[PDB]
Amino acid sequence: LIDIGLVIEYLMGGAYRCNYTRKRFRTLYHNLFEINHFPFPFHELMVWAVLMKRQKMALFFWQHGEEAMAKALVACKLCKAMAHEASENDMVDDISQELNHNSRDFGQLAVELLDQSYKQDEQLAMKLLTYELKNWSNATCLQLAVAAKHRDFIAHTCSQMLLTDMWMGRLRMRKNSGLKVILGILLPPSILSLEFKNKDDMPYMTQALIPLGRKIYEFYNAPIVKFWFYTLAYIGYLMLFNYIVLVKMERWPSTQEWIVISYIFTLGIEKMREILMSEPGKLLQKVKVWLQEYWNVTDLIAILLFSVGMILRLQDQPFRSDGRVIYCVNIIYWYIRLLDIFGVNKYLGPYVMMIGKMMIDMMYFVIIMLVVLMSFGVARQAILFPNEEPSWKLAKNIFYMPYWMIYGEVFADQIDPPCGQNETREDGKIIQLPPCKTGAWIVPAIMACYLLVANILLVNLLIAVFNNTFFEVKSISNQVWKFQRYQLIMTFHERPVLPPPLIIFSHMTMIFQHLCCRWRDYGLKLFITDDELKKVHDFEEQCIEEYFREKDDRFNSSNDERIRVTSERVENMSMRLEEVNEREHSMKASLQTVDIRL
Amino acid sequence: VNKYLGPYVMMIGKMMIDMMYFVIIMLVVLMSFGVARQAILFPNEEPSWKLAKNIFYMPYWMIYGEVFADQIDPPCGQNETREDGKIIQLPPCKTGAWIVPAIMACYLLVANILLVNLLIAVFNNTFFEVKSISNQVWKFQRYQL
Amino acid sequence: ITDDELKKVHDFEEQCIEEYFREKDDRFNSSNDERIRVTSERVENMSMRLEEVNEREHSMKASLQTVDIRL
Ligand SMILES: CC(C)CCC[C@@H](C)[C@H]1CC[C@H]2[C@@H]3CC=C4C[C@@H](OC(=O)CCC(=O)O)CC[C@]4(C)[C@H]3CC[C@]12C
Ligand SMILES: CC(C)CCC[C@@H](C)[C@H]1CC[C@H]2[C@@H]3CC=C4C[C@@H](OC(=O)CCC(=O)O)CC[C@]4(C)[C@H]3CC[C@]12C
Ligand SMILES: CC(C)CCC[C@@H](C)[C@H]1CC[C@H]2[C@@H]3CC=C4C[C@@H](OC(=O)CCC(=O)O)CC[C@]4(C)[C@H]3CC[C@]12C
Ligand SMILES: CC(C)CCC[C@@H](C)[C@H]1CC[C@H]2[C@@H]3CC=C4C[C@@H](OC(=O)CCC(=O)O)CC[C@]4(C)[C@H]3CC[C@]12C
Ligand SMILES: CC(C)CCC[C@@H](C)[C@H]1CC[C@H]2[C@@H]3CC=C4C[C@@H](OC(=O)CCC(=O)O)CC[C@]4(C)[C@H]3CC[C@]12C
Ligand SMILES: CC(C)CCC[C@@H](C)[C@H]1CC[C@H]2[C@@H]3CC=C4C[C@@H](OC(=O)CCC(=O)O)CC[C@]4(C)[C@H]3CC[C@]12C
Ligand SMILES: CC(C)CCC[C@@H](C)[C@H]1CC[C@H]2[C@@H]3CC=C4C[C@@H](OC(=O)CCC(=O)O)CC[C@]4(C)[C@H]3CC[C@]12C
Ligand SMILES: CC(C)CCC[C@@H](C)[C@H]1CC[C@H]2[C@@H]3CC=C4C[C@@H](OC(=O)CCC(=O)O)CC[C@]4(C)[C@H]3CC[C@]12C
Ligand SMILES: CC(C)CCC[C@@H](C)[C@H]1CC[C@H]2[C@@H]3CC=C4C[C@@H](OC(=O)CCC(=O)O)CC[C@]4(C)[C@H]3CC[C@]12C
Ligand SMILES: CC(C)CCC[C@@H](C)[C@H]1CC[C@H]2[C@@H]3CC=C4C[C@@H](OC(=O)CCC(=O)O)CC[C@]4(C)[C@H]3CC[C@]12C
Numbered sequence: 001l002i003d004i005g006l007v008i009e010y011l012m013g014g015a016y017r018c019n020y021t022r023k024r025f026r027t028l029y030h031n032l033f034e035i036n037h038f039p040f041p042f043h044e045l046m047v048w049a050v051l052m053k054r055q056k057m058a059l060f061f062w063q064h065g066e067e068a069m070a071k072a073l074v075a076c077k078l079c080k081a082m083a084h085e086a087s088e089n090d091m092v093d094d095i096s097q098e099l100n101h102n103s104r105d106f107g108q109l110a111v112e113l114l115d116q117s118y119k120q121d122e123q124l125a126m127k128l129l130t131y132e133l134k135n136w137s138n139a140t141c142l143q144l145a146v147a148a149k150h151r152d153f154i155a156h157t158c159s160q161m162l163l164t165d166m167w168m169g170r171l172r173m174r175k176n177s178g179l180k181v182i183l184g185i186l187l188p189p190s191i192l193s194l195e196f197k198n199k200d201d202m203p204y205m206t207q208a209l210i211p212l213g214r215k216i217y218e219f220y221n222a223p224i225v226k227f228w229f230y231t232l233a234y235i236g237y238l239m240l241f242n243y244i245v246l247v248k249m250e251r252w253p254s255t256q257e258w259i260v261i262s263y264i265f266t267l268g269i270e271k272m273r274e275i276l277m278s279e280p281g282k283l284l285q286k287v288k289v290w291l292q293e294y295w296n297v298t299d300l301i302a303i304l305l306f307s308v309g310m311i312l313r314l315q316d317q318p319f320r321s322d323g324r325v326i327y328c329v330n331i332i333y334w335y336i337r338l339l340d341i342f343g344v345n346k347y348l349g350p351y352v353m354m355i356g357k358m359m360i361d362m363m364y365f366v367i368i369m370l371v372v373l374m375s376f377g378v379a380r381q382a383i384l385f386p387n388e389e390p391s392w393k394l395a396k397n398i399f400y401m402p403y404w405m406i407y408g409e410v411f412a413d414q415i416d417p418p419c420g421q422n423e424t425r426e427d428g429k430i431i432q433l434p435p436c437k438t439g440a441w442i443v444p445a446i447m448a449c450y451l452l453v454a455n456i457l458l459v460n461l462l463i464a465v466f467n468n469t470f471f472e473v474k475s476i477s478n479q480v481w482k483f484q485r486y487q488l489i490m491t492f493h494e495r496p497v498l499p500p501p502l503i504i505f506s507h508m509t510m511i512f513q514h515l516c517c518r519w520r521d522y523g524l525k526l527f528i529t530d531d532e533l534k535k536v537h538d539f540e541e542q543c544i545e546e547y548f549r550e551k552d553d554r555f556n557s558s559n560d561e562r563i564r565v566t567s568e569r570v571e572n573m574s575m576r577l578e579e580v581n582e583r584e585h586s587m588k589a590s591l592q593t594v595d596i597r598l
Numbered sequence: 599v600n601k602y603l604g605p606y607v608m609m610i611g612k613m614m615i616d617m618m619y620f621v622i623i624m625l626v627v628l629m630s631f632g633v634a635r636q637a638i639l640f641p642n643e644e645p646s647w648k649l650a651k652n653i654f655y656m657p658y659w660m661i662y663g664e665v666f667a668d669q670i671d672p673p674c675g676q677n678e679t680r681e682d683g684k685i686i687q688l689p690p691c692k693t694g695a696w697i698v699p700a701i702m703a704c705y706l707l708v709a710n711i712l713l714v715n716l717l718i719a720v721f722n723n724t725f726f727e728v729k730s731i732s733n734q735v736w737k738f739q740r741y742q743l
Numbered sequence: 744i745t746d747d748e749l750k751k752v753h754d755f756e757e758q759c760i761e762e763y764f765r766e767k768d769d770r771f772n773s774s775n776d777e778r779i780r781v782t783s784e785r786v787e788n789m790s791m792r793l794e795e796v797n798e799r800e801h802s803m804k805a806s807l808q809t810v811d812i813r814l
Contacts, residue, residue: 245637246649318693324641325694328634332701335630342622351619355716362712404670407706408663463715470719559776562783569786573793580793583800590807597814 002029008047011081012074014147014279015522017137040065043135050075051082053095055102062109066537068544069117070133072110073144073153079103080148107150116547117539118158124539126162130204131536132525140525146486155482163485166204166493166524169222170197181225185232191219204524223492230492231341233499237263238338241331249313249324259501261310267500268303269507271296279522295340302333343481344488350477357473358466365462369406369454376450377402380443405447406454416444493524599743605732612728613721620717624661624709631705632657635698660702661709671699 005020012018019025028035038044042065049058062071083099086092117125129141136144142162145153153159172195173180184191196215219225237260244257253261278286291297305326313323343349377398388394401411420436496506528536555561632653643649656666675691744752771777 242633245633246643247645248642321641321693325638325697328637328694329697331637332630332634335626335633338626342626347619348622351623355623355712358712358716365711366707400671403703404665404667407660407665407710409665409667411667459711459715462711463718466715466719467722470723474723557780559779562779566779566783566786569790573786573790576793576797580797580800583804587800587804587807590804590811594807594811594814597811 002026004047004051007051008078011078011085012137012147013077013081015137016139019135019137040067040135043067043071046071046075047078050078050102053082053099053102055098055105058102059105059109062106063544063548066540067133067135068540069110069113069128069141070136070139070144072106072113073141073148073150074136076103076106076110076150077144077148079106103148107148107152110145110150111152111156112547113543114153114156114158116543118156120543120546121539122158122161124536125158126165126202127526127528127532127536128540129159129162130202130524130526131528131533138521138525140523142486143523146483151479151483154486155479160482160485163489165202166489167224169224170218171195171222171224172197177224178228181222181228182232184219185225185229188216191216194219203526205527206524207521208527220497223489226495226497227344227492229497229499230495233263233501234338234341237501238331238334241327241334245324245327245331249320251316253313261306263501264303264306264310266503266507267299270496270500270503271299271303273507273510295337298333298337302330302337305333306330346481349481350474353477353480354473357477358469361462361465361469365458365465369458372450372454372458373402374398376446379446383439383443384437386437402450405451406459410447410451415447416441490522490524494522601736604736605729608732608735609728612732613724616717616720616724620713620720624713627705627709627713628657629653631701634701638694638698639692641692657705660706661714665702665706670702671696 001020002025005018005025008018009016009021042061046058046061046065049055049061058075062068062075065071079099080103083096083103086096086099114125114129117128131140133139133141133144142154142159145159154163168174168177180190180194184194192212192215194215196218240256240260240263244254244260249257275286275290278289280286280289291300309323309326309330311323312319312326339352343352377400380402381394381397385394385397401414405411419433419440422430422432425431496503496510498506632655635657636649636652640649640652656669660666674688674695677685677687680686
């Protein structure tokens with residue numbers, strides 16, 4: 001069973017720790033090979049039925065026992081991991097397909113259970129979503145569903161409102177949001193005029209004058225407040241970057257440039273702290289799991305570019321202008337990175353990932369446009385300029401004018417200039433125009449063909465591929481944004497309170513705390529008591545019974561099942577009525593014989 | 599009041615929100631290109647409000663078919679004879695001035711080809727619902743009129 | 744409106760209400776789903792009643808055989 005524990009730990013991933021591999025179970029195993037009886041036998045039977053690919057037995061063991069949602073999410077993750085392992089080990093592909101179908105079935109079961117729990121009681125459904133699962137490595141149903149990449153579980157309304165409650169921290173608010181927390185951040189005497197939540201209304205915790213200080217601490221640790229502080233600091237830093245790139249700079253940086261440099265350095269230290277405080281042990285694995293996000297890669301590239309440019313800028317000329325140029329490219333990047341902040345709004349975020357989805361069709365359009373553009377450019381340049389030396393200006397003249405021809409600039413003075421003739425100048429003097437190049441009349445004709453093909457065919461076809469793939473991309477992007485709400489909320493909850501330009505104080509605070517702890521659990525669970533645990537378990541059993549037997553009622557009242565039952569009964573009834581007619585004929589013959597006898 | 603113009607007008611009012619979200623994204627891209635072009639082509643500048651105007655001036659008209667072809671990449675750092683034939687010395691090349699046409703190409707591509715066509719897509723795929731809602735709301739507001 | 748017109752309007756409203764309600768009933772009663780459900784319930788009751796009829800027919804056949812054996 002210890003090896004089964006390792007298998008569960010490997011398949012579950014992350015920081016999961018199976019109960020088999022814990023010291024209590026290993027001590028019991030060494031001392032023995034009702035103490036040997038399992039308190040939740042259906043948990044072990046479910047894990048066994050999932051592991052040995054017995055789907056019907058797993059679906060039966062899911063119905064019986066407590067913690068049904070957690071079991072379904074664990075089974076979904078285990079089936080997905082086993083399917084990935086079977087595909088990686090070059091096994092039979094049918095095994096991988098069946099395991100993925102089992103994962104999808106368990107995910108659908110968890111989603112239907114969430115629907116039933118939402119329909120019954122909202123608050124008990126959140127408590128079901130949030131309470132710590134002591135039998136599942138102290139995890140949370142939301143963590144289990146994120147870890148299984150169950151997009152439909154987090155996109156559900158109950159999980160969305162739970163994430164909204166997690167977003168506001170210990171604040172009631174929930175009415176004209178954003179403006180109240182901005183006014184609280186800018187004006188600290190506006191914090192105490194806010195409606196705060198109860199002490200034990202919904203205490204999501206990670207590890208389990210005074211009211212004024214308590215209100216201040218509860219406001220400043222709320223993830224919406226930390227997000228708005230981060231956003232205001234980023235906007236101020238971007239304005240300072242605009243000021244230091246627009247105005248000229250002297251030999252030494254000004255105050256605003258020093259603030260910008262400090263922001264860059266402090267953001268880089270924060271990203272290094274995010275690298276170090278990750279899930280793996282080996283540093284290369286942490287680096288890889290941090291570079292798996294594209295925004296982290298571009299952040300590292302931009303920070304390195306800013307370092308190079310600032311090093312170049314602190315020297316003398318001509319390196320200062322090169323550093324200024326690198327500063328301009330970096331300000332392009334940070335203006336683009338404003339879309340990270342735009343990712344939080346319910347409409348802008350799906351818009352941004354929708355743009356990211358259409359970039360591939362834009363790429364395929366750029367490929368075809370590049371073929372046509374280079375054909376026209378090479379033809380025009382090689383016709384109008386016969387005697388040319390090898391120079392890189394020819395490649396530039398290939399791309400220069402045909403590219404601006406797409407955006408309404410046809411360069412009408414150079415389409416077909418008058419040549420091979422004598423035309424009087426502005427002063428009336430006779431001016432002899434240079435002789436006509438051979439085949440120069442071909443250039444306007446191929447220009448007409450190029451402009452027609454490009455502007456009329458390819459742009460309208462890109463419009464068509466943007467239009468006919470819009471609905472699917474929009475639905476997928478909305479669902480992926482609703483899924484990534486959890487990642488955004490957890491990132492802003494694990495982040496320090498202070499924004500990046502002042503984050504060095506919080507970094508020194510963590511350094512001093514870490515050194516003090518050395519010299520002497522990433523999530524938000526609930527840690528409910530035992531009566532509440534029983535109440536939640538009873539609510540889960542009620543929801544499971546409700547869902548199963550309502551599914552039975554839906555199956556029994558369908559037209560197809562009714563028609564099938566009626567046809568089978570009519571067939572049996574026809575055979576029985578034939579038997580009845582035969583017995584009636586026999587009885588009539590017997591009655592006729594009895595009447596003849598008497 | 600007309601049976602066709604009224605629903606058209608409130609349909610325009612419904613598409614204004616998608617136009618707003620387009621103006622937001624266009625504003626981000628436009629300010630990135632404008633700040634980059636102005637801070638590259640003009641290194642020695644005093645604090646003046648003309649810089650903010652030069653951020654927004656030419657990139658905005660770049661969306662509507664005016665690319666300002668005489669200022670995309672002017673010839674500089676060389677000697678070119680004038681109209682009268684006199685030798686005229688052009689001002690020296692600014693550092694990184696070749697970046698401006700490249701980011702201009704990227705900006706024009708992204709804006710004119712991606713964002714305008716995406717706004718076309720969001721106008722097209724939300725047209726039927728907005729049209730039905732607008733017709734029904736116009737028929738409701740007939741009583742108020 | 745006047746009082747006779749008010750009565751006429753009220754009677755028209757009662758006619759419309761009756762028409763709508765019992766036409767809704769006719770639509771519900773002539774639907775495929777209600778027809779299928781009624782047929783299945785009648786077929787189930789008919790199967791149980793025919794089983795009872797077969798049992799009583801067996802009893803009657805045994806009684807007739809006994810009466811024929813007696814006479
Ligand atoms: C936290 C960051 C990301 C943005 C927050 C905004 C403010 C806290 C900063 C942004 C710009 C700063 C200003 C930038 C430039 C100056 C000029 C500066 O003038 C001098 O230092 C003149 C004397 C000298 O040359 O030493 C005085 C501070 C001040 C007003 C700064 C005060 C603090 C400001 C308003
Ligand atoms: C929180 C977010 C939404 C906005 C906060 C940012 C502003 C408070 C910052 C961003 C840029 C700053 C400006 C950047 C540069 C200057 C020039 C500076 O003037 C000088 O440095 C020259 C003379 C002097 O030294 O005072 C005076 C401050 C000012 C207007 C700053 C005032 C404060 C500003 C507007
Ligand atoms: C098919 C479409 C979607 C993309 C193809 C277009 C680009 C690959 C082209 C269009 C305009 C070109 C630019 C036009 C002008 C220049 C300036 C050139 O530098 C100089 O000419 C030096 C300064 C001078 O001599 O004036 C460097 C190449 C570059 C950036 C070109 C690089 C390639 C660009 C961006
Ligand atoms: C510099 C100027 C002259 C640009 C040249 C314009 C035309 C001579 C080119 C540009 C795009 C070309 C088209 C691009 C794609 C296709 C599809 C391809 O046809 C197929 O693969 C056959 C299947 C089918 O036709 O559906 C080749 C012909 C055609 C119409 C090409 C015909 C020639 C076109 C119109
Ligand atoms: C399928 C598509 C992508 C074809 C694209 C091909 C052209 C865009 C390339 C291919 C070979 C290139 C040429 C290869 C070599 C040279 C010599 C080069 O000459 C020098 O650098 C001067 C030599 C010196 O003095 O050092 C100028 C660019 C040029 C003409 C290149 C111009 C652009 C060319 C024609
Ligand atoms: C493949 C698609 C998706 C992206 C488009 C990539 C190419 C079309 C670009 C990328 C890099 C570009 C090159 C980058 C630099 C130069 C040098 C440039 O040289 C000069 O301008 C010399 C200066 C002068 O004499 O004016 C000429 C264009 C060229 C070859 C560019 C031509 C177009 C290139 C190959
Ligand atoms: C992202 C898109 C959808 C909107 C962003 C574009 C506008 C915010 C920009 C584009 C052109 C700009 C205008 C261009 C020129 C001027 C003239 C300027 O006044 C002067 O220059 C004074 C007179 C003179 O000196 O000639 C005042 C700002 C204003 C109206 C600018 C205000 C901001 C405008 C409207
Ligand atoms: C001044 C010039 C250089 C303008 C800059 C043009 C590009 C460098 C920018 C403009 C718009 C940007 C895009 C805007 C939106 C997105 C979606 C966003 O991606 C996601 O949110 C991931 C989800 C997904 O890709 O669907 C960030 C990348 C991307 C493609 C951006 C990549 C960089 C782009 C193409
Ligand atoms: C996230 C986006 C919205 C960032 C946008 C930032 C820029 C568009 C702003 C922010 C700070 C602004 C600067 C703040 C202060 C000044 C000083 C100001 O100088 C004067 O008015 C002269 C002083 C005098 O003589 O009275 C000229 C505008 C300028 C450069 C501003 C230009 C426009 C800037 C760079
Ligand atoms: C947010 C979206 C939905 C709407 C777009 C709003 C901004 C892009 C606009 C609104 C007001 C505009 C400002 C109004 C007035 C001016 C003063 C103007 O100053 C001059 O032109 C100085 C005169 C000169 O020296 O030429 C420079 C542009 C600027 C900052 C404008 C820049 C663009 C702004 C911030």
